[PDB]
Structure formats: C-alpha cells, structure tokens
Amino acid sequence: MALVQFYIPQEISRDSAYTLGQLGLVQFRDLNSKVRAFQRTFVNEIRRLDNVERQYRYFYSLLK
Amino acid sequence: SQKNGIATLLQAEKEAHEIVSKARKYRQDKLKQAKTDAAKEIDSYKIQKDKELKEF
Amino acid sequence: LTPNQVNDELNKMQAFIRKEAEEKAKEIQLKADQEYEIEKTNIVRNETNNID
Amino acid sequence: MGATKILMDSTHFNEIRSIIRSRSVAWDALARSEELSEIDASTAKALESILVKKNNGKTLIPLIHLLSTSDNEDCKKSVQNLIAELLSSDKYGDDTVKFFQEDPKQLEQLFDVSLKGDFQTVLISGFNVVSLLVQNGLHNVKLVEKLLKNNNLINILQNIEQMDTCYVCIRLLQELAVIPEYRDVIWLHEKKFMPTLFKILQRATDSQLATRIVATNSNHLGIQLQYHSLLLIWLLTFNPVFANELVQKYLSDFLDLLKLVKITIKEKVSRLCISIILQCCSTRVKQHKKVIKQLLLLGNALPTVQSLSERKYSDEELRQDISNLKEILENEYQELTSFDEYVAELDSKLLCWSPPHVDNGFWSDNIDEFKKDNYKIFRQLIELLQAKVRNGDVNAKQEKIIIQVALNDITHVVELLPESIDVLDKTGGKADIMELLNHSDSRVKYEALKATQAIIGYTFK
Amino acid sequence: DSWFQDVTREKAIFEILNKSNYDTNRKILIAEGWIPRDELATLQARLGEMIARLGI
C-alpha cells in the first residue's frame, strides 16, 4: 500500500531483509534509486532541503 | 531473481531515457520542418497571386 | 523476499518505466505538433503580408 | 501494415478484451438455426485460427456481411474482438488492415453495427472504426460527429464508475483529436463530455495515494485515466479561440488543475495540467489579458505558481513550463499603471486584493495622484468604506469583501503619509474604524486593528 | 509541533533517498517495499539497528 524507503550499505542487506520480514513488510526489492529519477540525486531534493531549513527557522521564531 | 532483476531494472531506465531522447530530436526537426514547408508555402502563394493578376 | 514477490515487483516496475516513457515521448511529440502549426502560421503570415 | 499501435498498451483495454476472448461462441450452430448463413460462421472459425498462426484479407468480407445482418450480440462481439486484435498486431492481421484502408465502403459498413447490442459490443465497434480513421488512408469527420451526438456510446463515457470502459472511450476521442480536423466537430459536443472529465480530476483529488486499492490512487489504472483526460483537454486547447472560451465558461472547474499539480508527484499529471493553463495564458489566445485577470483576482493563481516553482520534479520540459507560466501571470497584472487599477476598483465599488494592494511601493507613488483638494481620492475611499458598513448593513458577505480590502489600502497610505490623518477626521472615517473592531469576521477585524494602530502611532510621538 | 514533526520526517526521506552525493558515498543501498497501513505500526517499533525504518 504505502511506499516505505530504507537505506543501508550492501553488507547488512540480508540482515535487514529477515528483520523487515518478521514485521510484515512485503514486496521487498533492493534497488538503487536511479530508477526513480525525481527521488534521486538531482537539484530538486536539494531545493527541498532548503525549504525545510526555512521551515525550521519559522517555527523557532513563532515559539520565541 | 533479485540479482537478475536490478540489472534488468537498470536497463529499463537507460531505455526510458533513449525513447524520450528520440522524441526530443524529433521535436527540433519538427521545428525545422515548419520553416521548410512555409518556404514552399510562400512561392506557391506567390504563383497564386500572379494567377489572379494575370486573370485581371 | 520470496522469489514470486520479487518477480511480481520486477514486471510491474520495468513496465512503469516503459509506459511512463512512451507517454512521455508522446507528450514531447504532441507538443512538437503544436509548435509546428503555431510557428508555420506566424512565419507564413509575415511573408504573405509582403506578398499582398 | 499493422495499423496504429493504439489500445494495445492499456490494461483497461486488455481487461475488457479478456472477458470476450474467454467466452466461446460456436457460430456454425447459430447459422444452422438461422441467424446467419453458413459462409459467415466458417469464415469466423477460420479467422480465429489465423490469429494464433495460420495463413488473408478475403476473410474480411464475410465478417462485414455478418455484422450488419446479424443482430445476435454474442457473435458480433466475438468477431469484433478478433478484428480488433488483428488490426493492431504486426504478427497477424496485417493483410486485414489493407482491405479496410484501400476501400472506404468497409469503414462505412463497420460503422452501421456500432450502437447496437450490449455496451461492450459497441465499444469494440467504436475502437475499430476509430482505429482506421486515425490512419492516413481513411479519414471522415462524419462518423465521429454522429457517434458524439448518438446516445448509447456517449452514456457509457458519462458513467465514471466503470473506469475501464470510460478510459477506452476518452482515449478513442483524444486520438482523433491529435489529428486537426476532428477538433472542430469535437468542440461542438464539448458541453456533454467536458463536465465528466473535470469530475474525474476532482475524484482524483479527494482520494488517497498511500494504498493501491481498486479505485483511482496513483496505480496503473489511475495513472492512465488522469493523463488521458488532461491530454484530451490539452489537444482542443491548441486552437487559440477554444481556449479563451473554455476558461470563461468553465472557470470554477478550471482552477482545480493547480491543485492536482501539488498533490501529485507524477510528472505525467503535473506536466499536462501546467501546459493547458500555460497555453490559455499565452499571448496567442485572444483576450489573453482577460483570462489572466479572472485567474489572478478570483482564483489566486499567482501565489499557487510561486509555490509550485520551488518544487521542481525531474523532467526538463516541466521546469520550463512552470517558469514560463510564473512570468506571464505575475507580469500582466503588475505592469498596469498603479493609479489606474485603484480607481477602476474604486469606481465599481468592487475592491479586491491584488498583488499591488498588499505592496507598499504602489501606495508611495500613488499618494501624490490623490491630491486634488487634500487627497480627494483618498477621502473617496474613506467615504466608500463608511457607507458600506452603515448602508447595506455589516456582517453580510458582499459588503464584508470590500471592507477588509479597503482597510488594508487605507493603512498603507497612513503609515507612509502623516498628512492623511486630517482627512480621516473631517470625513468621519476615524469613527468608522472603531466600529469594525467589534464586528464578526476575523479578516475584517485584523485589517481594522491595523487601521486603528496606523492613525494611533502618529497622534502621540 | 505537528508541522515540526512532519518537516523532520521530510528531511529524513530525502536523505534516505540520496539528495546529495555525500549520502551516496556513505551508504550505497536504498531499497523499496510496500507496507500495508494497518500494519505501519509494527515497522516503526524497531527503528533498525543501523537501518532507518522511518517511512511514509
């Protein structure tokens, strides 16, 4: 149903698959993420990161 | 088939890129085409104007 | 996880990739159409003013 | 040959194609009982075997004959599916496509059997007639234009409950629209289908994307329905006049495309939405000014684009469209003379917030323009505001839009100019501010409070 | 508080996914999978030993 996103290095790929497994994850496929061009290294996500830094600042200023 | 499947998925991505790239070459050409068939559209309209002129 | 679940995920995704591009290509060439007519209409209009 | 390759990539077409090819139909028995003559059943029997692998166009003739003559739903549907499958295939039913394409007669015949029998039977019939029309050797406006006016096919398309059927029909029309000539007949019938298409986009907006249930989400089925609807729009928008008209009638429905752009993360949906809005906002549409005005004032298109611009998605063309649209919207409204916009609004007594009325710079240049007998125009706005509260009452919706905007406008001039305080006193505006404070509506009270404070800062130093 | 939690969670997705080259030369596997939402609960219970199970 809902997309879940996991990262690790390839070394604990097996150790991960089993634990995920025991909790009820399904259709577990290891990827990279180049096969989903928007949700890969590009300018686009880096701009989103800036957008969150602005968010952080706005919350702090309002709480003050 | 996990370590057969990624390799297939990498190939699919490279393929998705080449089909979209053929269209973009096509588009440039489509623009060039518009100027050529409009070059032909003037000298066929020119002979049309000489038509109703010579008729006059 | 299981081989059947991974093969189900392989067909589905490389399909998603192939389909999205075919439509993607299709939008690019549809626009190629649009620019052909608009660009022709313009270019033609000027030269025909001179001709007239 | 192998025709066009349309309706062979879609799952929705494939699910309908399964229902027919699974159920079997023994033509020869039907013929013996008299519903067709024998030549036809044998011809359909043989044809089915050629589809799988075996040696024609000459099998075509009986199928044409059989269809028009027969009124038995089962045989024409099973046959139509087999003609349909053949046309697009390059494996089989290459020769099939030739006979149709050469001779205008088998197209016209093939049309007669459309709109008879079960809802499926007719869908296959429409596919096949459309299939040929979109190729370069048969073209007739008449079949499309009649089928559009005609009931049984158009009913299927209005139903949205059955995604698969609806999808196929919308695609049938949108493909004919890729060709220029069909656009003119299609635009006559726009009223009927076009509310159905906006509804599909609306449905799309209220449901979730965090599941992959049977309904529209961001699944395979969904990704095709959204794309086609939008695409259909986009096509007819290529003709500049249709696009001006389309925004002015359909305005309310139109504004919703901006929403779909946010909620979706899919460059197929997003791109198409951005392009259609772009094309109407283009210079080439006559009364391009008008459509920008409606969109900016009422619908608040401009702020929406500025957010959109930030979240770039990977697709070069998408980024290009978003940027072009940001420029056009923003530029067209602001570039009007400042005094002119203010007075035009003042005159109608139909003030609205706009990008330069919440901007300080606009007011600074305009202070001088008002002075004609101690800021006569400024006093005009003060009279106008006073009146609205007292006459036509306060706390009803119409009068409530004018007030909040007017109080915003006044505040800005007073902060900037210390000499306008006199004008408020003479007029009696000073009193009127105090009254808005008590009044219901949060937005009116905010603006009212800001007005009081602006006078106040200056009275005591 | 709710938007603050939401915004933290967006930063984390981008990072997981690789939004810069540095995340790449530090973890090279990013995997994909589908979790029913009625079960979303149990996956987050164990955050993952050196695995991030922060999801959507």
Q: Where are the domains of chain D?
A: 12-339, 340-459
Angstrom CA distances, C35 to B14, C28, C41, D274, E49, stand at 28, 11, 10, 17, 55
Taking a C-beta distance cutoff of 8 angstroms, is the pair D345, D351 a contact? yes
For E25, name the nearest residue in chain A, comparing CA atoms only.
A9
Tell me the C-alpha distance between D56 and D59, whole Å. Answer: 6
Q: Cα angle vertex B29, ends B26, B33, to 5°?
A: 130
Which residue in chain B has the smallest CA separation from C37? B34
C30 inside 8 A of chain B by CB: no
Measured between CA atoms, how close is C9 to chain A, in angstroms?
A: 7
- Backbone conformation region of residue A4, classed left if phi is above 0, alpha if psi is from -120 to 50, else beta: beta
* Fold observed for domain D12-339: Leucine-rich Repeat Variant (1.25.10)
Contact D354, D296 (CB under 8 A): yes
Chain C residues in contact with chain D using a Cβ-Cβ cutoff of 8 Å: 15-16, 19-20, 22-24, 27-28, 30-31, 33-34, 37-38
Inspect the interface and report whether the beta carbons of C28 and D272 lie closer than 8 Å: no
Residue in A28, A31, A46 nearest the CB of E30: A31
Calculate how close chain D gets to A29, using CA atoms only, in Å: 17
> Which is it for the CA torsion D21, D22, D28, D32, positive or negative?
negative
Beta strands A26-31; A2-8: pairing state: unpaired
Cβ-based contacts under 8 A for chains A and C? 19
Report A:25-54 residues touching E (Cβ under 8 A): 25-33, 36, 39-41, 45-46, 48-49, 52
* Nearest residue to D256 via CA among D212, D209, D208, D206: D206
**Ramachandran region of residue D2, left (φ > 0), alpha (ψ -120 to 50) or beta?**
left
Q: Do D231 and C33 touch (CB under 8 A)?
A: no
Roughly how many angstroms between the first and final C-alpha of chain D, as a whole number? 89
Instruction: Determine contact, residues D291/D248, Cβ cutoff 8 Å.
Output: yes
Distance CA D30, CA D37 (A): 9
Taking any CB pair shorter than 8 Å as contact, residues of chain B touching chain C are 1-2, 5, 8-9, 12-13, 15-17, 19-20, 22-24, 26-27, 30-31, 33-35, 37-38, 41-42, 45-46, 49
Partners of A6 in the β-ladder: E31
How many whole angstroms separate alpha carbon D108 and alpha carbon D138?
Answer: 11
Judged by CB atoms closer than 8 Å, whether chains meet at C28 and B27 is answered as yes
A29 CB neighbours in chain B (<8 A) are 2, 5
- Terminal C-alpha separation, chain A: 40
Cα R_g (chain D), whole angstroms: 31
Q: Tell me how crowded residue C30 is: count the other CB atoms within 10 A of its CB.
A: 20
Residue C17 sits at the chain B interface (C-beta within 8 Å): yes
**Contact across the interface for D210 and E34, Cβ inside 8 Å:** no
Q: Do the domains D12-339 and D340-459 sit in the same CATH topology, yes or no? A: no
Q: Do A26 and C9 touch (CB under 8 A)?
A: no
Nearest of A54, D438, D106, A43 to residue E19 by alpha carbon: A43
Do E and B make contact, counting contact as 3+ CB pairs within 8 angstroms? Answer: no
What is the number of helices (H) and of strands (E) in chain C?
A: 1, 0
Give the span between the Cα atoms of D111 and D119, in whole angstroms.
Answer: 15
Q: B9, C25: Cβ pair inside 8 Å?
A: no
CA D147 vs CA D143, D189, D222: distances in Å? 6, 11, 26
C contacts of A36 (beta carbons < 8 Å): none
Q: Could you give the angle at which helices D442-459 and D397-416 cross, rounded to 10 degrees?
A: 20
CA distance C6 to chain A (A): 6
Sheet holding A26-31, edge to edge: A2-8, E29-35, A26-31
Cα–Cα dist D67/D443, whole Å: 68
> How many CA within 13 A on the CB side of residue D329?
26
Is residue D335 classed exposed, middle or buried when 0-12, 13-18 and 19+ CB atoms within 10 A define those classes? exposed
Domain D340-459 CATH superfamily? V-type ATPase, subunit H, C-terminal domain (1.25.40.150)
D187 secondary structure, DSSP code: H
Q: Would you tell me how many other CB atoms lie within 10 Å of the CB of residue D58?
A: 10
Which residues between 33 and 52 in chain C have a beta carbon less than 8 angstroms from any beta carbon of chain B?
33, 35-37, 39-40, 43-44, 47-48, 51-52
Judged by DSSP in three states, D256 sits in coil
Q: Determine contact, residues D277/D320, Cβ cutoff 8 Å.
A: no
Task: Provide the experimental method for this PDB entry.
Answer: cryo-EM
CA distance E43 to chain A (A): 6
- Contact assignment for A40 to D314 by CB distance below 8 Å: yes
Residues of C in contact with A17 (CB under 8 A): 1
Q: Answer for the pair D138, D101: CB distance below 8 angstroms, yes or no.
A: yes
Question: Does residue D220 contact residue C23 with C-beta atoms inside 8 Å?
Answer: no
Structure tokens at D44: 């359909």
DSSP run (H or E) holding A29? strand A26-31
Interchain CB distance below 8 Å, D275 and C20: no
E strand or H helix that includes residue D177 = helix D163-177
